[PDB]
Amino acid sequence: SLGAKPFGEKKFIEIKGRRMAYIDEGTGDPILFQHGNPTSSYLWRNIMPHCAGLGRLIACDLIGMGDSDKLDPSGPERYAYAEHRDYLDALWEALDLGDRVVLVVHDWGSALGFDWARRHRERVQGIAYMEAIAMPIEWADFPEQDRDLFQAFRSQAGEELVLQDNVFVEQVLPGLILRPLSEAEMAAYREPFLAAGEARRPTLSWPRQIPIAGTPADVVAIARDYAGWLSESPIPKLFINAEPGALTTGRMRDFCRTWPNQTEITVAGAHFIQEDSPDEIGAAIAAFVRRLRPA
Template sequence: MPRRSNYLKKSASVGGRTMTYIEEGQGTPVVFIHGDIMSAFLWHNVIPYVAENHRVIAVDLIGAGDSDKLPPGGEGTYSFGTHAHYLGELLDTLAVGDGVVLVGHDWGSNLAFDWAMKHPQRVRGIAFGEALLPPFDWSDWPAMVQDGFKHLRTPEGGQDVLDNNFFVNAARPNMLRVLAPEEWDEIVRPYANPGEDRRPTLDWPRSVPFGDDDTEMRRVLEQQAHWLASTSIPKLHLAGTPGGIEMVGGRRRDTISTFPNLTVAEVQGLHWTPLDDPHGFGAGLAAWLKTAEAAELEDASRPG
């Protein structure tokens, strides 16, 4: 399978901060958006499947990868709205134009949904996996996940993240593939310094609206699910087996099944599917893009 890790990152000034990204190839823009604890590195073995004939952009979200950290501001510094703002400004700076394909994982899926909702006429398709979608009952999460997230909601859990990198370190046992040491080193590198440098890895999980949480984030995610069930924009669900937060047999899969114009590609993995099964992820994405682009050409060739 294609493998590559020696990408040269580029940088752009966004709101007085430097954001970094990988850019490869030419053609239809395909924007890769990672989620919590990750960076553009999440996609390093997926990018080769689509970069040959597409303009691939894999972003480092603000506070992640080699992008700047924000000034210390305590809880909520790296809110969903803040991430969405910086991502939107970056894509404007990079002039992604129209016909954009968005590829997201974890919270990156939800950031993709957010951008698509704001710019539906500019979106050619949305590929996603392990997205935060309703329902949010505690029972819809694996027991091990429940325990970890309940811990994170306590003051002690928050300190455990900032002092001991708890949330990042908890990811490693939840992967099917054994990562090479240099892969793991690249994942943890942006969070090497204790304290506020690790704040992004705490703000994300604390944003998940569990149980009866009545929060703005819950309303945002429910609105995304409603919109996805109403739009005809082509969608690809890169569904992990057995999966993580979108686990096989879980009710989140039922939510996703209501989305029109949906293709499902099965990949092997728990939560971190682009790392667990980059071949399945990349091949599934490439096949979907090829089919969608062929259909567009066929439609365009029909007499008006």
């Protein structure tokens, strides 16, 4: 169902001097849900229930996001993709996941998840993805409605737009959910970013990492690697498509449809589809896991 309550209480693990937060409920092989920008584990609160009894349900909060500690010093060079990966690789190692992990990913959680899978292919039982960064793109592939705003985040205007005005949280987030959110839901997303300044840096560093028109070259190279790999991987996949969707449309959606051993469903939503169609998403993920783990 819909609802504002979180799925569980956060547990914490020390990673490289910082405390990282995550939800971890149940037992069994892991079903790992990874949020992206400007969200946290809260994104999956109404989807995880569908997998009750199917595995150890885990949702990690990326460094500087959700209830995971903020990095200090922080500034323009902080919270880039490689730094997020360094922290997340360590947390996932610390979680003792074993070799039958089902990844459920979104946005930057998909770039991080796809990259981890390419590097630990034998430990990945299945991948469910939605509104993902499945390959490097061009501006022509970016949703028309926010193209100018995202070019702005990537310019020097970003510090004012995000560190001062918190536009990713206050405007982009609700602007890409079809239904109006309650105050409690909005409060959950605003919480890690209530403070003006560096506390909001993760939500500005992220759009500056999207692999568009070849920049930043480093993330473009990483996405090219996992795109090439996924397009050829026999690992079972669940493509949770969205209408109208946002990122995974046009060229990128056509490319994802060429991926092998994949099942697809379409749900109503723009980018943060978990807020619009949680039960349809959860049900398909549960059906996918039951197929992968015949009881």
